Ligand binder design. Sequence first.
Ligand code: ASP
Ligand code: ASP
Ligand code: ASP
Lengths: 327, 317, 306
Amino acid sequence: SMLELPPVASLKGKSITSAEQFSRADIYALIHLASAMQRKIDAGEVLNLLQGRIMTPLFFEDSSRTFSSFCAAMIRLGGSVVNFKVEASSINKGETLADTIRTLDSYSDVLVMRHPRQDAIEEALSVAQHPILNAGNGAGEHPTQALLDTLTIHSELGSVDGITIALIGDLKMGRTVHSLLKLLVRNFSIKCVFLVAPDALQMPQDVLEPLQHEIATKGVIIHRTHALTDEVMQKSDVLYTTRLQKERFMASTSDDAAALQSFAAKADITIDAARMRLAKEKMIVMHPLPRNDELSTTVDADPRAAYFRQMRYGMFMRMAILWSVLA
Amino acid sequence: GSMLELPPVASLKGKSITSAEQFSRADIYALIHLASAMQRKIDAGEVLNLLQGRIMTPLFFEDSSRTFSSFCAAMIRLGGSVVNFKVEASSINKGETLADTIRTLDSYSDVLVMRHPRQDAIEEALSVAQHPILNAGNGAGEHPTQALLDTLTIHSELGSVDGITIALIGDLKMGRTVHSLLKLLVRNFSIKCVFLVAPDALQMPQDVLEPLQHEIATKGVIIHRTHALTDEVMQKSDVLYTTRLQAAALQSFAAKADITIDAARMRLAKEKMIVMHPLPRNDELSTTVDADPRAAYFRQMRYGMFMRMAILWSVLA
Amino acid sequence: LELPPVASLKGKSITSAEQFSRADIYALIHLASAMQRKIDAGEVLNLLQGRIMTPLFFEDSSRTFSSFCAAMIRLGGSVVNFKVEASSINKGETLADTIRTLDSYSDVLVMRHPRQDAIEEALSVAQHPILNAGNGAGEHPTQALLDTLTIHSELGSVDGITIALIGDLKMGRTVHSLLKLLVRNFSIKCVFLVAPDALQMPQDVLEPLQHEIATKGVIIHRTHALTDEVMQKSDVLYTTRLQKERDITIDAARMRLAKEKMIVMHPLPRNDELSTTVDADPRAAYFRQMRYGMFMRMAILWSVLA
Ligand SMILES: N[C@@H](CC(=O)O)C(=O)O
Ligand SMILES: N[C@@H](CC(=O)O)C(=O)O
Ligand SMILES: N[C@@H](CC(=O)O)C(=O)O
């Protein structure tokens, strides 16, 4: 209870759209703030930092973790939430996205927006007076997931510089791995990244190209594979795996069918207890969730399974973010 | 010192809100001044604890963005709480009736906010409820709190409500907002002129106009029906209040372009006037108007929150 | 201070009527009464400020969802409004993973599920207490507690009553928990089981109770009708709806046969088994029952999270 909760001043009043916005020092300030929030909350302390402030969720596509995490974080800061549901709104009388933004912006202090269109967040930004926090924009980015994933690595392993990390699964559509790769390469001295995915679902060039300067000058090693090889298993300090983003492959064309099929047919990427016999002693398995069969329930009892603790780090990072934006 | 800064409107204490007809001119002004004061405190960053421990339950049988969210935000900004009941996930799917649903919410709540597709639904709810019910829209009947926030908007933007010329535009037949607004303005203020701008099949109902004939006569209000935003409607109106289309189809189509407000049509409007829309809008109110200082239909929603604070506080004080 | 939590419930999941002792039930009853006095006098409680309940409803509710949230709020607590329809279940997430998810952020989970054994599977992974708000045709333990608060407050005594349990007793999770709670912890004079044969109280509820039934000498009679005898002797007529998703009507005419001092109860919602003509009778306790439910849920949440 003697710990301060200094807001991160550079976040004040700003929208959060991309992992690109953050400096290394922003990241560590949010990490220590989140960690102090965790200590206070776990000790049973009641925070009243955002009394009388309102978050409104605008979720134009589904969420459990993200919506609930954000609501919980707001509440644990003493904040409030208006439970707006897009599916039961005047969008059903033809209301536009822009008008819907202005509508909840009339009542709220912060908007949390998730949308299947990558450019919808920009549209919202151009009409909103209050900050908007990007909780996922199609296959674009998920910048607060990247921050909490980094809190997880820091808290679990004790260090982010020097790690070897595998990014596994649907890298093409994974807004989580897009933001995470950006945030780690821009701001830390990463030893090596394994990009583990079948050919069709590899990390996009529009993510890798902007990073090419920093990759080359910081000496980050980048290796593509289509499988969890013995080498990937033995060298990785972090195995970060992801779900096939099937709802992004809905055009019913021969290509979407072949891309959907590649996860199981063009790659060997399942993590289970058999495969975990190859891992380091000091390493963690992470997954943004939800998972399907790429991450077996046989790993759940393993102490290196960090994907449940990841969600709780998530709540505290979101608290740190909300307090900083709104202080 | 909240009785100096935020005194509740006594006449509203513990009462249900169902119709624009139930308010006096003094009621309206007291709500306006209270709403202005709520706004000043909230905008200054001050945190209100007036309704801590009190619960509002929204009971929305129709879709809403403004009215649902507005009411929740207003309750929360008063320090109160909201129980997020949703009809579609409720025991109504086990054959439960409307009176029983009301009694249920009534056992937990301090105030109910009800929107329903049927006009007589409020009367049924009232006959059974022990706590106040606020009518958030009853079929094609009324929307009494929209009429209050609309009046707050006029008052705050133009300085005065007496003496205005207002056009009510669009689907006046099914528009519960214009039914409530026409009643609140004509009953309580001295309006100079109302233009009722609609194709014939969607004109203002007689059941709204006939009970008003006495106030119309005593105050000498001028009422003109048009099927277009004519040069004259555009030149004389202090307020253009337009609405979304909710024989009627054919007349609507034929009139659409003539009742559309866009930047080209605004070249004929007064320098000092406002465009209002309770929202949501479709094509009858062009996005080309959004940058015009006279476009008041976004600020109108924020006035709504403060007016709803004023209402909730007066009801529950 | 004036609202001592029930110590035995601290940090515990609530899954069955069986887990309560008579002393537990009375401590909750007196706590719920004290909570009701403070709330009805206008006092604001701040007991659970900063604590979160997440409802996890895999089926429809009106009363149960609302009264849990209202109770939480009136203790000063907060609610995270998780929806199953708008969630990552649609992306393929399992029930266990869903539980772990709400568990990362919440202090207490309130779970309702069409599968009888989903609550057990939930408990095997949750760190925080789960309150069973109804598991299939199994139990509804907090309904049985509020029903007993209702009987206590309305009649003054639970020992000695004659109670009729009426309707769909086979699928009625409410009458399962309530029979268990009454028979184990009180000395009931007589239970009428009023149901057609196909919907009678199940053997898996009656058999575990046979020892208590026999040693307290509870009378148990099965009928398929609300006979004049049931009507004249019952202190409580507890009636229920046909559980469709899985001569008994009470109307003003039938009520001419009831005692002066008795109550009609119904967990709700009702269909035509309980006529609107009964609603203005002072013995119609089924609306007041919902309000006792809110206070008993306050006593429960406070005791769980103190
Ligand atoms: N829940 C995360 C990961 C996923 O959906 O697979 C997201 O929305 O991006
Ligand atoms: N939102 C207003 C007007 C409209 O729907 O167009 C109402 O609910 O009545
Ligand atoms: N509402 C009670 C009784 C019923 O549904 O009829 C239950 O959930 O079990």
